[PDB]
Write an enzyme that holds these catalytic residues in place. Structure first.
Site, short mmCIF file in Angstrom:
data_model
loop_
_atom_site.label_atom_id
_atom_site.label_comp_id
_atom_site.label_asym_id
_atom_site.label_seq_id
_atom_site.Cartn_x
_atom_site.Cartn_y
_atom_site.Cartn_z
N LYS A 286 -4.49 -13.55 3.40
CA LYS A 286 -4.81 -12.21 3.89
C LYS A 286 -6.27 -11.86 3.56
CE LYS A 286 -2.08 -10.13 0.17
NZ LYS A 286 -0.74 -9.46 0.04
N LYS B 229 -9.16 -8.92 2.91
CA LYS B 229 -9.35 -7.54 2.49
C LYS B 229 -10.82 -7.17 2.57
CE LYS B 229 -5.22 -7.21 -0.25
NZ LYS B 229 -4.56 -7.26 -1.57
N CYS C 205 1.02 -0.67 -10.24
CA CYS C 205 1.54 -1.04 -8.93
C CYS C 205 2.99 -0.52 -8.81
CB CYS C 205 1.54 -2.56 -8.75
SG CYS C 205 2.81 -3.36 -9.78
N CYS D 71 3.37 -8.02 -11.88
CA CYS D 71 3.45 -9.48 -11.88
C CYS D 71 2.01 -9.91 -11.66
CB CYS D 71 4.41 -9.98 -10.79
SG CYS D 71 3.81 -10.06 -9.09
N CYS E 297 -1.46 -6.42 -7.81
CA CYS E 297 -1.63 -5.23 -6.99
C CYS E 297 -2.16 -4.01 -7.76
CB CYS E 297 -0.33 -4.88 -6.29
SG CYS E 297 0.41 -6.36 -5.54
C1 SRM Z 1 1.49 -0.84 -2.69
C2 SRM Z 1 0.53 -1.81 -3.47
C3 SRM Z 1 0.39 -1.56 -5.04
C4 SRM Z 1 0.27 -0.07 -5.34
O1 SRM Z 1 1.02 0.44 -6.17
O2 SRM Z 1 -0.60 0.59 -4.72
C5 SRM Z 1 1.10 -3.20 -3.29
C6 SRM Z 1 2.45 -3.60 -3.29
C7 SRM Z 1 2.88 -4.88 -3.00
N1 SRM Z 1 2.04 -5.94 -2.71
FE1 SRM Z 1 -0.02 -6.10 -2.90
N2 SRM Z 1 0.01 -4.03 -3.14
C8 SRM Z 1 -1.17 -3.31 -3.10
C9 SRM Z 1 -2.43 -3.84 -3.33
C10 SRM Z 1 -2.79 -5.14 -3.65
C11 SRM Z 1 -3.93 -5.53 -4.51
C12 SRM Z 1 -5.11 -4.61 -4.80
C13 SRM Z 1 -6.04 -4.24 -3.65
O3 SRM Z 1 -5.91 -4.78 -2.53
O4 SRM Z 1 -6.91 -3.38 -3.85
C14 SRM Z 1 -3.87 -6.85 -4.72
C15 SRM Z 1 -4.83 -7.61 -5.56
C16 SRM Z 1 -6.12 -8.10 -4.92
C17 SRM Z 1 -5.94 -9.41 -4.19
O5 SRM Z 1 -5.43 -9.40 -3.06
O6 SRM Z 1 -6.31 -10.46 -4.74
C18 SRM Z 1 -2.64 -7.28 -4.10
C19 SRM Z 1 -2.14 -8.58 -4.11
C20 SRM Z 1 -0.92 -8.96 -3.60
C21 SRM Z 1 -0.41 -10.33 -3.50
C22 SRM Z 1 -1.10 -11.56 -3.97
C23 SRM Z 1 -1.98 -11.99 -2.81
C24 SRM Z 1 -2.66 -13.31 -3.04
O7 SRM Z 1 -3.75 -13.53 -2.46
O8 SRM Z 1 -2.11 -14.15 -3.79
C25 SRM Z 1 0.85 -10.25 -2.96
C26 SRM Z 1 1.86 -11.36 -2.66
C27 SRM Z 1 1.60 -12.15 -1.40
O9 SRM Z 1 1.08 -11.60 -0.42
O10 SRM Z 1 1.94 -13.34 -1.40
C28 SRM Z 1 1.20 -8.84 -2.70
C29 SRM Z 1 2.43 -8.34 -2.24
C30 SRM Z 1 2.83 -7.03 -2.21
C31 SRM Z 1 4.23 -6.49 -1.86
C32 SRM Z 1 4.14 -6.18 -0.30
C33 SRM Z 1 5.32 -7.49 -2.22
C34 SRM Z 1 5.83 -8.43 -1.13
O11 SRM Z 1 5.10 -9.34 -0.70
O12 SRM Z 1 6.98 -8.26 -0.70
C35 SRM Z 1 4.32 -5.31 -2.80
C36 SRM Z 1 5.12 -4.21 -2.24
C37 SRM Z 1 5.83 -3.48 -3.38
C38 SRM Z 1 6.61 -2.26 -2.91
O13 SRM Z 1 7.81 -2.18 -3.21
O14 SRM Z 1 6.02 -1.38 -2.27
N3 SRM Z 1 0.02 -8.14 -3.07
N4 SRM Z 1 -1.95 -6.20 -3.66
C39 SRM Z 1 -0.81 -1.93 -2.65
C40 SRM Z 1 -0.47 -1.99 -1.22
C41 SRM Z 1 -1.86 -1.87 -0.71
C42 SRM Z 1 -1.89 -1.68 0.78
O15 SRM Z 1 -1.75 -0.53 1.23
O16 SRM Z 1 -2.05 -2.68 1.50
S1 SF4 Z 2 3.89 -8.05 -6.14
FE1 SF4 Z 2 3.70 -7.92 -8.42
S2 SF4 Z 2 1.76 -6.84 -8.64
FE2 SF4 Z 2 2.39 -6.42 -6.52
S3 SF4 Z 2 3.69 -4.49 -6.58
FE3 SF4 Z 2 5.09 -6.28 -6.78
S4 SF4 Z 2 5.25 -6.36 -9.02
FE4 SF4 Z 2 3.38 -5.12 -8.58
#
Ligand code: SRM
Ligand code: SF4
Ligand SMILES: [K+]
EC number: 1.8.1.2
Length: 453
Positions: A98, A100, A317, A362, A366
């Site tokens: 993905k 960003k 998160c 984890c 996020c």
């Molecule tokens: C809602 C949020 C955290 C929060 O409390 O705000 C969130 C929540 C989740 N993130 Fe995210 N991420 C959120 C920002 C981010 C961030 C920070 C940022 O972007 O500023 C990161 C870290 C930066 C990065 O990408 O390196 C991030 C890195 C991930 C990853 C690991 C991605 C990777 O490159 O390995 C995953 C898992 C995946 O996609 O495999 C993930 C996966 C997910 C999922 C959709 C889990 C899933 O794949 O099923 C989580 C949903 C949880 C739920 O129940 O809502 N999320 N996640 C943010 C949603 C942002 C948005 O509107 O799009």
């Molecule tokens: S994937 Fe991990 S870091 Fe992202 S919301 Fe779920 S528990 Fe939080």
């Protein structure tokens, strides 16, 4: 469900639509503001008709929400930067991993640029945007005990005039698309590609594809990442009221009808709202004459309940109960955890101070713990890895200090450290910088090589 909403700008009409749907068609009944300036519904029992009806759309599209500094000190710069975030967003709309992207307006790094693949840092002259410094390659995701994964800060490529924005945006995406690892998804991200091929090689290919030559980076500095809680003077006779919303969770709580209060404000509000990268909400463009009315609703709804600077600068998160990848609680743990930290800050005479403290459920990261001064990374139920040494502006990755420990163990460690910072810190020295100067933790100077011990 998660919506595409460049820059976190949402109209009051759109807000009423999402407010309705959240209350009636979801299990939790909440609106959860995310740290990428958008919102999510949890437990959807469709939405796309409702979104589309108000001019909204929920995002194989390997693209996430494009961020834009929400409340610039130089208020007039927002409109232009916002226009550009929207254009980049549309331009990229239909990758290995993905992608960003952000548009940043110094001196604020509220959008946390180092957690992103592509960042356009606005450079203005005489109140007008003239170009962008491009920084590429940030990403925070790691895998526990896997030294082949690492959080990485973005690298400076150079400066480009405004006119070349889209071509450069396209060149970066395509170069990553082509060069990205074609096997292992856990190494597909831009941060890995850059380390494999080298910044100059990647930079050169981008120039080749965009049809330009990057100019030297124009000077820029960041002074912080927090929102400006409360009233700030915008352009004209307009004001912006930023409301602190703990964990960005909007729901009516007994004696604190946060969700209803926002609906009531939406109904009488002139401008629109802005969802910030710190999971807060800005009631934007309130005419001076309307300040009192808006303040009345926010005040009575519990939306303006004063919190410590510490709580204002803490983030977590979603994690349990909805995240399927959760290892430890984050959102549900943060409130009481900060209650404990607040005591520690008072005990040490630093209640007016703050430490950018984040908890991520984890290692996916996020909650952006890997850019915090103090980051907690979930490892198992009730256990986290404690990282120390980031800085206030978010340009350094904190190294792992203690591993797989519980809250009581975490508080004990922080009680000692905060105590040392309080008495040993220099004038205006941040906690993170202090741990590094005092030799408490070795800094991470080149993440791809020195993040792991
Ligand atoms: C809602 C949020 C955290 C929060 O409390 O705000 C969130 C929540 C989740 N993130 Fe995210 N991420 C959120 C920002 C981010 C961030 C920070 C940022 O972007 O500023 C990161 C870290 C930066 C990065 O990408 O390196 C991030 C890195 C991930 C990853 C690991 C991605 C990777 O490159 O390995 C995953 C898992 C995946 O996609 O495999 C993930 C996966 C997910 C999922 C959709 C889990 C899933 O794949 O099923 C989580 C949903 C949880 C739920 O129940 O809502 N999320 N996640 C943010 C949603 C942002 C948005 O509107 O799009
Ligand atoms: S994937 Fe991990 S870091 Fe992202 S919301 Fe779920 S528990 Fe939080
Ligand atoms: K918040």
């Amino acid at each position: 469900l998660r919506c595409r909403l460049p820059g976190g700008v949402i109209t009051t009409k759109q807000w009423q639509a999402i407010d309705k749907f959240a209350g009636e068609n979801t299990i939790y009944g909440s609106i959860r503001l995310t740290n990428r300036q958008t919102f999510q519904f949890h437990g959807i029992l469709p939405v796309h008709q409702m979104l589309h009806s108000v001019g909204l759309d929920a995002l194989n599209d390997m693209n996430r929400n494009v961020l834009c500094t929400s409340n610039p000190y130089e208020s007039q710069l927002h409109a232009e930067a916002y226009e550009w975030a929207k254009k980049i967003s549309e331009h990229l709309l239909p990758l290995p991993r993905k992608f960003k992207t952000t548009v940043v307006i110094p001196p604020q790094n509220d959008i946390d640029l180092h957690a992103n693949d592509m960042n356009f840092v606005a450079i203005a002259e005489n109140g007008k945007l003239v170009g962008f410094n491009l920084l590429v390659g940030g990403g925070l995701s790691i895998e526990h005990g896997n030294k082949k994964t690492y959080a990485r800060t973005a690298s400076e490529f150079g400066y480009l005039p405004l006119e070349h924005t889209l071509a450069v945006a396209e060149a970066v995406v395509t170069t990553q698309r082509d060069w990205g690892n074609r096997t292992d998804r856990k190494n597909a991200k831009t941060k890995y590609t850059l380390e494999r091929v080298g910044v100059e090689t990647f930079k050169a290919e981008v120039e080749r594809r965009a049809g330009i030559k990057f100019e030297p980076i124009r000077p820029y500095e960041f002074t912080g990442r927090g929102d400006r809680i409360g009233w700030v003077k915008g352009i004209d006779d307009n004001w912006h009221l930023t409301l602190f919303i703990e964990n960005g969770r909007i729901l009516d709580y007994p004696a604190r009808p946060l969700k209803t209060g926002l609906l009531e404000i939406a109904k009488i509000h002139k401008g629109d709202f802005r969802i910030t990268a710190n999971q807060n909400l800005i009631i934007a463009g309130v005419p001076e004459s309307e300040k009192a009315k808006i303040e009345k609703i926010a005040k009575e709804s519990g939306l303006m309940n004063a919190v410590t600077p510490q709580r204002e600068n803490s983030m977590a998160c979603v994690s349990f109960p909805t995240c399927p990848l959760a290892m430890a609680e984050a959102e549900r743990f943060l409130p009481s955890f900060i209650d404990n930290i607040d005591n520690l800050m008072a005990k040490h005479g630093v209640s007016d101070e703050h430490i950018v403290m984040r908890v991520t459920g984890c290692p996916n990261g996020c909650g952006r713990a890997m850019l915090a001064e103090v980051g907690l990374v979930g490892k198992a139920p009730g256990r986290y890895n404690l990282h120390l040494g980031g800085n206030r502006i978010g340009t350094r990755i904190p190294r792992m200090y203690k591993e797989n420990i519980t809250e009581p163990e975490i508080l004990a460690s922080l009680d000692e450290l905060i105590g040392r910072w309080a008495k040993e810190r220099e004038a205006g020295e941040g906690f993170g910088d202090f741990t590094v100067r005092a030799g408490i933790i070795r800094p991470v100077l080149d993440p791809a090589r020195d993040l792991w011990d």
